[PDB]
Subunit: 338 residues, 2 copies
Amino acid sequence: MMKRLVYISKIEEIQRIGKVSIKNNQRDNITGVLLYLQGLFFQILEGENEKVDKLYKKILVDDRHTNILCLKTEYDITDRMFPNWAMKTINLNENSELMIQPIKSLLQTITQSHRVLEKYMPARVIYLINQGINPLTVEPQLVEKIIFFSDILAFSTLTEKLPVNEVVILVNRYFSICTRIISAYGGEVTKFIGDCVMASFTKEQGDAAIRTSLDIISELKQLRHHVEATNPLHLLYTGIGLSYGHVIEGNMGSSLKMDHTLLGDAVNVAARLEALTRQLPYALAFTAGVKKCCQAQWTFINLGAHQVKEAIEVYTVNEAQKYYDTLQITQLIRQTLE
Amino acid sequence: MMKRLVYISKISLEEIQRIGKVSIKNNQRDNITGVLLYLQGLFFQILEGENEKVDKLYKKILVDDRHTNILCLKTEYDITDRMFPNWAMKTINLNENSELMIQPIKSLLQTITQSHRVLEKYMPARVIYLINQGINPLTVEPQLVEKIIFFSDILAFSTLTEKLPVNEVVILVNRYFSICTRIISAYGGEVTKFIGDCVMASFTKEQGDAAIRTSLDIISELKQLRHHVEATNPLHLLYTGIGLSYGHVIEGNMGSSLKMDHTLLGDAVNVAARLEALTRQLPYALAFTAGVKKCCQAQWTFINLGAHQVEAIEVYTVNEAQKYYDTLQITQLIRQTLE
Ligand SMILES: Cc1cc2nc3c(=O)[nH]c(=O)nc-3n(C[C@H](O)[C@H](O)[C@H](O)COP(=O)(O)O)c2cc1C
Ligand SMILES: Cc1cc2nc3c(=O)[nH]c(=O)nc-3n(C[C@H](O)[C@H](O)[C@H](O)COP(=O)(O)O)c2cc1C
């Protein structure tokens, strides 16, 4: 019982790789091809499922290539695609045969475009593709999730005073910090909504959601004093709202336009809790449901009941206390660029 | 000096070899050369020649019956040498080539291509437009542009998600997105993203009339949809409210290397979303700002809804958007239906 997987990755040393591959693939009864064109890697692997997943696990951690996307996984294949090739390496760059020049140039234009599109896809969708699962045909399921929401404090004022490029530098720097921190703790960013970041966590990731929130506030606090006063990054603040509940996670839309979205009351609650941090001396606020997903011991602070558009309990942690004032900031932002 | 463009498309031998006959004859009288390759129901074509000769030719290929979902991937300008000087139009049937050496390239081309096709469906319409124009969307700078922000969402959606089984909520939301995306695109709008049950789109400042007709068409097609199905279908309960605004917004792609997204930043984006919720409290399913009103040339029968705290802004609508129903009785009827 064998399987076949195909992946692309971003890059004489290659000849050393192919010879080591022929050595190990024979020993592991693995067949397949490695093709490379214009600094790109294309490899097809096939063999028994145990020995293949053992091999692919090594190649994912290889130094020489990165941006490794597994496009297709075949299970229970009937016949080997290349039964005689332990690991045939094909340098498409050196191939000057004029009957393959179109297909070779088409394999580049489509692959270059395919990587550009990958950077816009939702994180969950890319995960589904790496697992050999067709994202269009995955039944949306009801799952218990922690909803994350973070946006820039007083962003309306910042668009008024700053020129366009400084606003874009700022918004990009904010998204970059959020995504890297969220992804590092295991959270899945769903989409950017204006200046708002939306992510989710599994119900066992209550501590990671709180720690992600604290780490984002920390990385922004460092950035503000790490740069000069004229740098617009000196004005970057955030508030974060978390919520727990059941949501429908899946792919909605038409064949024309499709997206990955979460449907549920908790989505709006986390968004409304986030906007509440403008009126609290805490850059973080979450429901009691998030509080009950946390195994670790936090010094939880009760902020009372608040009416969210009946009133729910709102909490925070002692680490997330603001040293500044929300009004002091909107003034010091307006007056800095005044 | 010539231009060269590449595109993929989807199929709708003797019927196809005929395309080679007609095209070879014209490509020489047009001083055009290129290759046409097809594999597992997909079309690939490269072209080159004087710009005027290619622009007029690609316009004919764009409206051809025998293929659909055409996407131009690459476009190079100011080239010296033709990549294929010998062939006015050489067809290649990769489904009928099995030289051993070509098998890896062939299997890789269909896989990468299918995957590419899937990714397009998730791409924002604006990113696809930049790809069609041959412009790398990753290197484009965001700019301040004047837009009409479109906002619409499903009425009483919190009630439906509670009463309906999960698989039935999906059908309703898919159908709603399907109707909105179809109408918004047909009027020259760009769906920018779905936000839960919410649809956000944008129209240029010359499309004020297209923005209103888009909103009335969506209300019309849902009203038609409601009485087209049975009363036990979830679609019998699908209503909508729409809000529009006009203002300067920063349109452009943003994000890190990990995640990129095309988004709109501006005061008007929030102003539009507040109007879509204001329709709950109005006898009209549509509500737009006075800025949208000045983008319309058609003699609309505008209705003034006064100023509204959001400092206050003027709210307008058209008589065609009048709700033939009470909004509050609808939220009651939806509950007492699935109850
Ligand atoms: C593009 C690429 C293709 C590779 N192909 C193979 C392969 O076909 N077979 C294989 O065993 N390893 C392959 N590798 C990875 C190396 O085998 C692996 O990183 C290393 O040789 C581990 O060897 P070791 O067992 O001595 O520790 C590939 C790596 C890259 C970057
Ligand atoms: C996939 C495809 C590729 C085509 N490529 C060319 C082409 O390269 N040159 C050309 O003259 N016609 C090409 N055609 C034909 C045009 O679609 C058009 O129908 C044809 O030029 C009709 O010629 P007419 O203007 O005399 O009616 C192509 C058609 C298809 C379906």
